[PDB]
Amino acid sequence: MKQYLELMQKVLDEGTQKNDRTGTGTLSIFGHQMRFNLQDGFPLVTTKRCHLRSIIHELLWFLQGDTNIAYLHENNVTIWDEWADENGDLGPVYGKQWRAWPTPDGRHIDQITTVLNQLKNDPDSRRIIVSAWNVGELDKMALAPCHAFFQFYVADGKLSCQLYQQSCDVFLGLPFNIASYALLVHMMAQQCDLEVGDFVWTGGDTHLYSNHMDQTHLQLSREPRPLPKLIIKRKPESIFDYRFEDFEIEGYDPHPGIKAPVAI
Amino acid sequence: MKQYLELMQKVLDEGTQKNDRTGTGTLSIFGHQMRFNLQDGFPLVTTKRCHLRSIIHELLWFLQGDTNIAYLHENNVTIWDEWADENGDLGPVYGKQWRAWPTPDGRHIDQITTVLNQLKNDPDSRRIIVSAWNVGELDKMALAPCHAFFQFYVADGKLSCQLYQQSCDVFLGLPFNIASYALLVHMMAQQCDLEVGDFVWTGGDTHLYSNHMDQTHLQLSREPRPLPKLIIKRKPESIFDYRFEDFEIEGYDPHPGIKAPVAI
Incomplete structure (x- = not known):
């Protein structure tokens, strides 16, 4: 999409050479913001095919407060294998913090429910926040949250949302992230x-890995197709009762996919 | 300044009518981002006089990990009286979280030192973050952090920083906030x-209170003067050894100040 391709370009033009923890070089810029009117359609990148299936199962997994990849495996979703340990444990990541942020006094805050209450009983609140950035459990995590802070x-009668992604792989991870959170916005709005x-x-x-230049130029040459339409086949009794099948993307006609290898 | 006045205007033009917790109406927009090249000068609003004194003492206070207003009083700084209790306690706010974020296992993380180490030993890190948003101690706080998340x-050889202000009084609080964090950037950079x-x-x-319209239009009519220059008279041994006198603003010739009343 336009906003996306605009970023991709900006990174090429203005990005400064920076290296990452693995030794692979990246082109990076700091601080960027793009808006997506959700009434204009579901922000699913068209200049390259994206498989929403993994996206959906991961979101549902988060909402379950689960941090073991078992559920993902039952549905043959392996985007988290790379980090899970022999038991399939990733540590107190996203899910755990969203649904059971542990306090020093023995409690576990359910930030998702907390947020739902606010949207329903005090919508003008300016502190409708969900944070995955729990300083206390950073070490125990498989890896630090890429996207760790979002506000509703x-x-x-319009529910908006801003996500802050402290670190971002523009080519590989960004498309996935945008769709994932966009889907969360819809679920929230439906329940409210x-x-x-x-x-x-x-x-x-915000960066691009040096060894993703060709893929970038290749995608950067495609023309954005119209955005698809996300439809929810039903209205679960709660934000925790959505099932994979409830979602159906409509009118999604993307360009072919583009493989993006990574060094190890 | 330009970026500032541009926001002020945008809020007037595009802001939607929203009410706050006190009943006073505000004009508000959601999601905005402005950049300030620190080499161009210290971002201290000129189209209206701002007293940096309070700013500085508050920053130093934070860095001390102090959450009692005593220190502020010794210097006759009362911007926090409104919230402090009879003992002058504000709860586990900014200072406490920055210097002693409490973990569930009895520790207290020093996010400021943590951040300093990273900037010195692993500058390419993408997780150089300081968060005041501690879900665990929200209730015990005098009020929730307006600005609760920043990244370095x-x-x-250039140190940048992005602050996320989940809630913002454009007219009263924004100017103060920008200068405060800008000063923190300089201190950080000096020590690194x-x-x-x-x-x-x-x-x-991002909002404007309905009863601040005249002040807004009045300021919105002034022309930005050149930015002043911030100078540090010395180099303390650490980020915790700065004293009020070490800072000197130079070339600051602002327009007159503008009072901004508040309802209660």
Whole structure:
């Protein structure tokens, strides 16, 4: 999509040479923000095919507060294998923090429910936040949250949301992230009888890996097709009762996919 | 300044009517981002006089990990009286979280030192973050952090920083916030032998109180004067050894100040 391709280009033009923890070089910029009107359609990148299946199962997994890849495996979803240990444990990552942020006094806050209450009983609140950045359990995590902070906003029956991605692989991870959170916005709005507003994406260290240049130029040459339409076949009793089948993407006609290898 | 006045205007033009917890109406927009090249000068609003004194003492106070207003009082700084209790306690706010984020296992993480180590020993890290958003101690706080998440970034000997302000009073609080964090960038860079890069400001619910319209239009009519220059008279042995006198703003010739009343 336009906003996306615009970023991709910007990174090429303005990105400074920076290396990552693996030794692979990246082109990076710091601080960027793009908006996506959700009424204009589901922000699923078209200039390259994306498989929403993994996306959906991962989101549902998070909402379950599960941090073991078992569920993912039952559905043959392996995007988390790379990090899980022999038992399939990733540590207190996303899911754990969202649904059971542990306090120093023995409690476990359910940030998702907390957020739902607010959207329903105090929509003008300015602190409708979900944070995965738990300083206390960083070490125990398989890896630090790429996207670790998001805020919800209500105005005119429209529910918006801003995500802050402190670190971002523009080519491989960004497309996935945008769709994932966009889907979360819809689920939230559905349970709150609210219309979807804007999904605002903000990033810190936004980069492209040096060995992704050709794929970038190749995609950067395709023309964005119209955005598809996300439809929810039903209205679960809660934000925790959605099932894979409830979602159906409609009108998605992407260009072919583009493989993006990684060094190890 | 330009970026600032541009926001002020945008809020007037595009802001939607929203009410706050006190009942006072605000004009608000969601999601905004402005950049400030720190080499161009210290971002201290000129179209209206700002007293940096309070700013500095508050920053130093934070770095001390102190959450009692006593220190502020010794210097006759009352910006926190409104919230402090009879003992002058504000709860586990900013200072406490920055210097002693409490873990569930009895520890207290020093996010400021943590961050300093990283900038000195692993500058390419993408997780150089400081968070005041401790879900565990929200209730015990005098009020929730307006600005609760910031990231540091290094590239070409230039240290940048992005702050995310989930809630923002454009007229009263924003100017104060920008200068405060800009000063922190400089202190950081000084202790890391790095040059200052960009201070990137991102906001969630960015608003103007309905009863600040005249002041807004009045300021919105002034022309930005050149930015002053921030100078540090010395190099303390650590980020915790700065004293009020070490800072000197130079070339600051602002327009007159503008009072901004608040309802209660």
